[PDB]
Enzyme design. Sequence first.
Site, PDB file in Angstrom:
ATOM      1  N   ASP A 175     -25.936 -24.646  33.616  1.00 27.74           N
ATOM      2  CA  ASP A 175     -24.735 -23.818  33.604  1.00 27.74           C
ATOM      3  C   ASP A 175     -23.509 -24.595  34.067  1.00 27.74           C
ATOM      4  O   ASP A 175     -22.399 -24.330  33.593  1.00 27.74           O
ATOM      5  CB  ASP A 175     -24.938 -22.585  34.485  1.00 27.74           C
ATOM      6  CG  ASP A 175     -25.954 -21.618  33.911  1.00 27.74           C
ATOM      7  OD1 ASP A 175     -26.282 -21.740  32.712  1.00 27.74           O
ATOM      8  OD2 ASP A 175     -26.427 -20.736  34.659  1.00 27.74           O
ATOM      9  N   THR A 222     -23.228 -15.626  30.789  1.00 24.18           N
ATOM     10  CA  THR A 222     -24.196 -14.704  30.200  1.00 24.18           C
ATOM     11  C   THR A 222     -24.204 -13.369  30.933  1.00 24.18           C
ATOM     12  O   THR A 222     -24.378 -12.313  30.313  1.00 24.18           O
ATOM     13  CB  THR A 222     -25.592 -15.328  30.213  1.00 24.18           C
ATOM     14  OG1 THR A 222     -25.970 -15.626  31.563  1.00 24.18           O
ATOM     15  CG2 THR A 222     -25.610 -16.609  29.394  1.00 24.18           C
ATOM     16  N   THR A 223     -24.022 -13.395  32.255  1.00 23.05           N
ATOM     17  CA  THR A 223     -24.005 -12.154  33.022  1.00 23.05           C
ATOM     18  C   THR A 223     -22.732 -11.358  32.753  1.00 23.05           C
ATOM     19  O   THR A 223     -22.760 -10.122  32.716  1.00 23.05           O
ATOM     20  CB  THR A 223     -24.145 -12.460  34.514  1.00 23.05           C
ATOM     21  OG1 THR A 223     -25.378 -13.155  34.746  1.00 23.05           O
ATOM     22  CG2 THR A 223     -24.140 -11.178  35.333  1.00 23.05           C
ATOM     23  N   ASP A 269     -28.975 -15.303  37.317  1.00 21.63           N
ATOM     24  CA  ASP A 269     -28.391 -15.411  35.987  1.00 21.63           C
ATOM     25  C   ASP A 269     -28.932 -14.290  35.107  1.00 21.63           C
ATOM     26  O   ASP A 269     -30.150 -14.136  34.968  1.00 21.63           O
ATOM     27  CB  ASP A 269     -28.704 -16.778  35.380  1.00 21.63           C
ATOM     28  CG  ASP A 269     -27.996 -17.012  34.057  1.00 21.63           C
ATOM     29  OD1 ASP A 269     -27.190 -16.152  33.640  1.00 21.63           O
ATOM     30  OD2 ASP A 269     -28.245 -18.064  33.430  1.00 21.63           O
TER      31      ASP A 269
END
Lengths: 527, 550, 520, 51
Positions: free
Chosen positions: C386, C88-89, C55
């Site tokens: 997540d 987020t990535t 992540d």
Amino acid sequence: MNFGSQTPTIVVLKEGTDASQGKGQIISNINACVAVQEALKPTLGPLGSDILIVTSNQKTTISNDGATILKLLDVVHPAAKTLVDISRAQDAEVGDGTTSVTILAGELMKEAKPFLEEGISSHLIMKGYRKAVSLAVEKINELAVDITSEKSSGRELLERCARTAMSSKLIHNNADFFVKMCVDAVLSLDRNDLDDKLIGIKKIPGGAMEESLFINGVAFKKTFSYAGFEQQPKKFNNPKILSLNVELELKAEKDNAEVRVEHVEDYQAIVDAEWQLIFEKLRQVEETGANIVLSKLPIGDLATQFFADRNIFCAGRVSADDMNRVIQAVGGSIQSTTSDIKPEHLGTCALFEEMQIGSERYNLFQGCPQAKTCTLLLRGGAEQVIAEVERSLHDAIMIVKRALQNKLIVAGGGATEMEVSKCLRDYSKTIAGKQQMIINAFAKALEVIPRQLCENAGFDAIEILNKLRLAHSKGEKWYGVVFETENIGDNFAKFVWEPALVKINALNSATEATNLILSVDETITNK
Amino acid sequence: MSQLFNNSRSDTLFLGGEKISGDDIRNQNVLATMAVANVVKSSLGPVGLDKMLVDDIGDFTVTNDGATILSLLDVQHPAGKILVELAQQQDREIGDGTTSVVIIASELLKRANELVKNKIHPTTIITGFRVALREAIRFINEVLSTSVDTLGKETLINIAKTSMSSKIIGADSDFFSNMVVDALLAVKTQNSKGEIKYPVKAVNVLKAHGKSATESLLVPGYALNCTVASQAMPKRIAGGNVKIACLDLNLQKARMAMGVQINIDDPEQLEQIRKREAGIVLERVKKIIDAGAQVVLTTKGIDDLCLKEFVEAKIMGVRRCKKEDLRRIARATGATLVSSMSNLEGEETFESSYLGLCDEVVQAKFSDDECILIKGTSKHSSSSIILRGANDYSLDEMERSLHDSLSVVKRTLESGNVVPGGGCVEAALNIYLDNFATTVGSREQLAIAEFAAALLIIPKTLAVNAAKDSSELVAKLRSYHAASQMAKPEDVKRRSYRNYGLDLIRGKIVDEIHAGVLEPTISKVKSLKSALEACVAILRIDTMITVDPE
Amino acid sequence: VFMNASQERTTGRQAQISNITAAKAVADVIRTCLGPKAMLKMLLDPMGGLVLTNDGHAILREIDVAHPAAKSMLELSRTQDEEVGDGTTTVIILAGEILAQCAPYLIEKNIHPVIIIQALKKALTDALEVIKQVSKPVDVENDAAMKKLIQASIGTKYVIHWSEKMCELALDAVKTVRKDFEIDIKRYVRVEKIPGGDVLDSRVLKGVLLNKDVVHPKMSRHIENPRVVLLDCPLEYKKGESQTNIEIEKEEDWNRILQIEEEQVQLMCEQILAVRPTLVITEKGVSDLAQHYLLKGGCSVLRRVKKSDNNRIARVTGATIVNRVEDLKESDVGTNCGLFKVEMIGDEYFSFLDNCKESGLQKACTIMLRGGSKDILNEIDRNLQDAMAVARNVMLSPSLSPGGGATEMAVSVKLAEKAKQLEGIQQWPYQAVADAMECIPRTLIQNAGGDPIRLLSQLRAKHAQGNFTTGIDGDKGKIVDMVSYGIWEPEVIKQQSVKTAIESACLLLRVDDIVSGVRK
Amino acid sequence: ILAGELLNVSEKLISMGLSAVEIIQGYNMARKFTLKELDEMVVGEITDKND
């Protein structure tokens, strides 16, 4: 795949190299030229002040002009070296106005400061200076009046031009006696060939400046004065000057020659043979009747011993630059073979006397009407005054040197810069473009020379320039500032004149020096 | 521009650092002036770009305001602190023209220093600036334009967009225009017996990074940033006429006054004395709960001892908050702030007049942060703005971007007369001062003529940051303004020009009235007065004396 | 010298180039962290621990990057986590490419940044409409549809092998916290982990898992219907705010002081026995004297409890926290507790509280996890946060966006069509946005080992004619449609990726000069 | 300048996944076509080289 550990990034340029680009680099280059100009601002004008500079060797040198001032200090920043090149180029070509060239070259960069802060890049700024410099030179040629139109005397022409360069120096008060010297120095030289090495001035410590003399002869000073000196008379009537490039010595500078003698009786012959070889060259000199013997190489003892009984004066170890100055006034030229000396190679003169000044004896050639050379012996209390007056007369002779080639009457003392500036303003009104503000700034930048004239005189420079523009409205020329009467007026009635090569080269050097730095937006310095 | 330093004279001796005199001081003053001036030149105008500063701890600050940039720069030069404190004075008083006053005052020093070398005396230079400034103010009063025949709030909407330019909110200024105008009109109050004034900072600025900046919601009421004491309390209050209690009294176990020492001769008294310590606090909270207060605000933290009764009574508890934030809550809802609970009589009592009134009190969670949204206030209206961005550093810029927009609109409603912006006034003051001083002339004509060209630095700097041709725009600003100064007020035409120019976006000369860019007349005045005092103080200094610290 | 300033000042175009190059290096490290085949990144903290995850949020958080512009990319990680928690990535890779792809100019064209910013604002508005048109709504009441939706974030993680079991844990955790709109929060979700065990044996159990054994051996460890009462006050003797300073004249007064301390605590124990609670929980420490009178009446004593656990216990059993013992009533006593048991594990004891499961306050639950080590537990916990965050977007936003890189490529096709119709000076910044949107689906090909030239060429051609659901397959690296691919992603995740990346790019374009080390 | 821009235009080629093997063949075939088209554009053919 990597070799090991971590690999840092490699900087393109070598570590320690200073490189910066953009508009900030040009401003740093202009500020380097303005800082150098700040020292030469008060020096401009007859009331200018000298600058005292001490180098790392503790050698005291005082020079008013900006040519030598920039030679004493070691300049590092590249843009500041540009003002040094124009000072040395103005010195070698002409030698007058070397300070005014730096003032004009730096003022053009100062007037370009508000233009660079705007959106105008430096390429369009140089176009206005290159266009205005072509018209400014043509204006000087139109204001030059030929001296032969009035059918005046040629001697009085060089006197008024020489007194102009005497300003700002120590000669200004003493110019009465000193101008009458340098004017007679250029007349001795040939009008076709003018040389600055023949006018070379010797530095004699002590004495007074007004005690100096001017004689068409030359002085080779002295070196050793071997055995037989001080007996020979130092006052001659009509001596015959002889010069020899051959060295008179007994086996001194000659290469080693191995002599092998297998007999005792034959050894007595080779001893007296050297006495006959040296006295053979000395006997051939007496047959010519030469009362003065000069040589570049040292003179042996036996030589001076031979001429001691004959009163003939002999002095060796004279520099080549001095001997080349002697051969012109003595007529015929050095013969290095004693057997080849002919009567027509000898010199003469009306009077010869050797007198001692400053604990130093000098041989002075006198009474030479056909002499094409000249000498200048300067004195003074300080040794720095001698170096200042020597450089003062050096630039003063260059005025009458360049005047004989081309005779042109050009105004000076702020009179020329104000007339050319107004002609550029009337031409800029028809441009209707970016060049309108550049030419108006170029004409305003030419006013910097009259600025330091009034600022160094104590009077305000605002009221003077206001009176100029109101006066220059109607057609006027030679109109300028006058320091003696304190009121600005016509300089033609003041008789102060200046050659045309000073104003033409000052405009071309200032424009060339300004466009060179403004065209560089990035500076890279390694090591 | 200073080389060779200075030769130390032995006949002149003073303790501490050496004394430098002459033109070297004024050369270092301009050198120190251009150092802080070049920083704000690139940040001026909608085409301008701000700068970044590292705090050495890894955190940085990105802001277009020239006051914050100069505040973060600590200047060791004595005369350099004047321009630094000038920016802090500009945004504190007027709130606008912070970058302009630094650049104007910088050009005044650069041109005056060049005049000192001209041999004109500085007092004559200062006299030329003050006489030209007195006539420049009279010209500002002639170009004033009173808002007339305008539809709705468009007058304040177009002016607010000018301050939003040059900052990150300039692209979103279309959406943010209605939020700023409606924010200062809701906090409208009355004082000085009929005079209308507005509070500063009264609009709460909350930072929640997420979604987009165009989706920022305008709350019709005040919002407070705090966390609930007990998570078992309801986060939403249903029904109207919600009672809010603003109190400075914390509910906690408290020690008796230090001047009291308890001495007991009986063990039996330890039960009643220890119980009464908590019982004294119960008497104050009991009368408040019986009043039906839904939300109780408290300035100081509340221990879990008194938070039990709030859960049973369904009362929302509150803990430490800013003292200045609780004042506008009570004034908006009608509550009265109580520093210490007391009555005229010697007996404790609670009156229902100390409770506020509103439509509802809700707690909304923005990202991981929770804040209270108070909507529909009763006594006085309020407002709040929640700024949203990509990161917290952009929110720090939007706060100063929003605070500067509130100061411009605040000064707009105080004086109905406004002047056109975008370099229109600076170009108009140039020609007006060119014909000026021509009658007097003499020596003062040169000092006044340089003051007119000194104001040209603002319009010329704007064209440099746009990567366009400055000489093309400056020549146009001088073309329309020059010929129209002599116009006679009939036959029209004429003065219809000169009122507009210098559009950085399209690079053309367009009408500022149709464009919408305007500036209050308060921002123009007092900006040249403060820039003059900064120029006069520095110019009058011949010699700087530095004393070494002990 | 002057102030704190100068040193090496970076001015001109090289100041923006340094901002583009530094921000581009941020996305290059996690460039391999996108996709189902994404690798892992091991981080070394100064504290001595270890962080291994794919992540980009946890990777960029612990890494210390010193640079003015590059730190702005680090702050974008918490923007996607705190608002949503998924993607987020994707945001860092997208925002890193936008700055390079959308603004290579000013090195060549010399275009002003604000002119580019004005085009990015219009490109962001049109990009949202394209996502809304390609988004098909999905029913939130379908359990089979939510299982395939949670597996979206699972497909790129290590728990994809357990994805059949993982969707059972994430669905029951979000549905329990959901309160009836349908606002939930992860503060009540427990991250507590069990070292060792089998992942298949891990299950979400209602209630709060306590690590503390019973205090006294006679305390019953098995109760059919536990009754829980929470006490914030300690059972010990309270000294008081002010000193007592008893002056003892006679020897009989000192023994009464110590006698009342036994009776005063006994008085607080008798008031507790009025509601006869089976389990008594105290926030602070407890004296060994108070446990006897509570054991006689049937009460149970426990170790001191943190404030965070007291809020979760009150939600499960419906109890109300009661600080004052005298005010304790039967209405605040927790009921409907399924089972109370204690199991032995070598590390620590564990106490179980079961809910009777049968509107009111939202229920609380804990997630038990059995891993292979301590670090594997922290990896699955980040995978659950997540995965459970995906179910929060579909409930608040029933709209469902295309996944597998189909959202970013669908925008790139629409921007290229309107780029020629717009013309003007903004055509270059507007068309350059489509080039930065196709980099995310291009990363899926580079990680799969395929040819991005031939695949992306056929992807754009089949996007217009075939459908808007066409995307890149992660495992096979082929051209497939998201309809038959069976996995979708919420629109909130795609909206946060487009908005945050564009709004952050406008901040770095406005940077003129950079000055470091001014002051603190 | 020309050699520096050929590396700058390759920034997009490598970013699209184009290997450096096929990039060399792209410039080699384009260079041969460039030299062949320069002859037809010459209007300045001059046989003097004297005046």
